[PDB]
Symmetry: C3
Subunit: 323 residues, 3 copies
């Protein structure tokens, strides 16, 4: 195929982060997504690719927990500082930056790096708000706290963690919209309500339908002006029947069609600037078909964010051959 | 904060498949009381009722199955429900087959003259003892409760105590997909409002709930009796049930119904019926059905998809 | 009262996967006849047609597999279909692969030139013999039937009998999700209207049906040909099929399409294709697909999810 509806320049970074949580196996998410044919699929869409490979993270030897709860803070903070450098570089060179996870604490680095695009906005697709502060978290898992480090308005509620001094809150509460929420901790509900952070929970999707959810999301984020979009997509936003290979599955999620629709609409803006595809943990699948299904779904989301659609039309056909 | 009473009704004589009597045990083992406690409910457990058996109770008019046993168990259940409601509790009854709504609705109506009913089921359960083809009383409970059908209903043995207590405009069905021709005639003829799966496909569950409440509580506040048959859900989500019908409610739709019922602040009684764990092909399928039953009950008392049940007042500061 | 002719067309040569020839029997074993009878249909079963096997049938231009075999079997089928239509029967052809639509549509158009087609499938089946990569004729049936496409279709051995009968404005697709680049080109350049899965996600199935009928029968009433590929449904619902594609129609959406088709009173012929019981991983997976095939056909002839199929106008009195 020589003709395509659009030609995107895409950078791919593997970020096998696992220290943002306790379940082993999420470090294998990048290799699982790659094995599901990610690079071939993007090439088939006419993308110009730059593969940065899979990043290497050496854990800090004396990484003592913060306030007897926050686990691996120097390792998470430091690995995110290195990831932020790679993202800033890829975006600076003109690539839409795809980061494969790895747990969701990697968004601290991808969003910080990307903003180095200060007017970026974030579409956070997840069953979870990931907005616990280091003081509200009950698990001490940093994948449940990334948004707290990034939002300007929450700065006074967030203590300075070891290995996190480099972070400057980059997004305002009006510049992030959540889609898919269904497992929100009481302090997170408090934060979303009191800081007027807009979200479309599963109940909002049940009422509005995904078409109106995307229209409203774009009105909130890019209604006033064109802005680079950061799509942070947790695989657990999808129903566990569709995405079983993940750490914190919650029943009643997005259908395959709703998830593709989100990605298709993001592509249709022509503003996608960085994408995170996180929390694929092949080890938590009960079977190879369950693991492959989850990895295939991750590839479908990424492909749809760069032009794959249900009707085709991504690949341009010149003329029909005559007998 | 809600005052919630729980009654186990291990009864199976409203139908022919054995095992539905284990439904209350399955729901309790799925952690019902712990979940309601975690939502701040002031609870009262009445336990699992031991229904007085009727030894001689064979086929009536070569059609009606166990009329004496169904009539008696429902009379006994009506007494326990009446006790819970008069004591100020929102009454949760765990089934057991759906013939048990004869008892729960009769018991509730003894204290609520203006009660209304939301009947969530794949079936209308409105055959009269003359229209029924199976003779199974779980397919007939609404016929004994509806005032407008009194002249169409014969007096069955053990059913003399029942007083029709609901009018045709006071019951709304949600989830219908397997309706008998006489049931269809009854619904249309008597102007009984229903939202079948086809109506949900067209309108969406949000409009279905808005219209349901407009019909029932649009003019005035009334106590709500939610009669919820687990088979309203798609059999892939609720396989452990006697009469599964494909193309049912999704998990999201069922939670939405329960959340909207909670939001009225008028839920007065809830029945969670037809969970038959013995009909599941595996243990996990039985447990999935029981877990779904708990989610319906918890959502009916405040459990949400947005984390607003436990109120946080101040975030800790560094 | 609907007069319905059931034809078993055990086609398999339109594709490479074996087992799809056992599709008509799998649908019968799923109780198709018992179901259509219960709906008050006047039935004629032609049984399974025995097509003349072509021993010497080499590939056309080193790509098109079994051309003569597919072309001849469709010629025989078009005659049986033309005769069943002539006799006053609504023709239900059981598949078999989707290349059989060449035969069913051709036969139907001989007596119904103003027919319109509702093609329900994950695929547009509109590759020409020159655009196909697989050489499988089930991916090309619509190219041989479309009037506006005649100059781009070469004459294949055993395909000369086919006269392009359907125009581009007389076919509407529903369910599309796996469309090859030359197929997208064809749909867009020949103005063929379609409702992909993305259009369904936006509009909802009720609006999709309203718009489908607006396009086809907005100006006048016309005979309807419903060509239904079982793969239109999500593979979780219809796994026993050759080319499954994730994110398809739900059970509810598929029933709604069939109900709307029934509601026009204009249904003249129906194809139920691509059920392959051999591709199922278990016995229940094959049975599920066959049961789904029966529900589609039954709903196209009156089966409802509200029980309004049978005339009932008087309640029995005690
Ligand atoms: O704070 C926590 O540990 C918890 N809060 C909600 C669930 C869990 C976090 C899940 C992270 B993720 O989005 O997969
Ligand atoms: O009358 C009957 O036996 C039949 N009519 C419709 C289906 C069945 C009733 C099923 C009872 B239930 O709600 O599970
Ligand atoms: O041309 C081809 O072989 C391919 N194009 C699209 C997919 C396949 C056709 C599938 C036929 B069917 O509707 O089951
Ligand atoms: Mn997350
Ligand atoms: Mn999550
Ligand atoms: Mn019932
Ligand atoms: Mn039922
Ligand atoms: Mn087809
Ligand atoms: Mn197909």
């Amino acid at each position: 195929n020589l003709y395509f509806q659009s030609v995107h320049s895409v950078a791919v970074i593997g970020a096998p982060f696992s220290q943002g949580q306790k379940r082993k196996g999420v470090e294998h998410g990048p290799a699982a997504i790659r094995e599901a044919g990610l690079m071939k699929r993007l090439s088939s869409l006419g993308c110009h690719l730059k593969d940065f490979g899979d990043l290497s993270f050496t854990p800090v030897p004396k990484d003592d927990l913060y306030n007897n709860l926050i686990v691996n803070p120097r390792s998470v903070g430091l690995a995110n500082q290195e990831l932020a450098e790679v993202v800033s570089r890829a975006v600076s060179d003109g690539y839409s930056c795809v980061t494969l996870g790895g747990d969701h604490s990697l968004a601290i680095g991808t969003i910080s790096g990307h903003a180095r695009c200060p007017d970026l906005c974030v579409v956070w697709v997840d069953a979870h708000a990931d907005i616990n502060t280091p003081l509200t978290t009950s698990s001490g898992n940093l994948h449940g706290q990334p948004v707290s480090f990034l939002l300007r308005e929450l700065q006074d509620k967030v203590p300075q963690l070891p290995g996190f001094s480099w972070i400057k809150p980059c997004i305002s509460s009006a510049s992030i919209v959540y889609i898919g929420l269904r497992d929100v901790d009481p302090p997170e509900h408090f934060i979303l309500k009191n800081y007027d952070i807009q979200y479309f929970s599963m109940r909002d999707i049940d009422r509005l339908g995904i078409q109106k959810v995307m229209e409203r999301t774009f009105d909130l984020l890019i209604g006033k002006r064109q802005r680079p979009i950061h799509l942070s997509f947790d695989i657990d936003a999808f129903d566990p029947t569709l995405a079983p290979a993940t750490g914190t599955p919650v029943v009643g999620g997005l259908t395959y069609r709703e998830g593709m629709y989100i990605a298709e609409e993001i592509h249709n803006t022509g503003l996608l600037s960085a994408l995170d595809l996180v929390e694929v943990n092949p080890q938590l699948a009960t079977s190879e078909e369950e693991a492959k299904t989850t990895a295939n779904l991750a590839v479908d989301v990424i492909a749809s964010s760069f032009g794959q659609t249900r009707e085709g039309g991504h690949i341009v056909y010149d003329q029909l051959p005559t007998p």
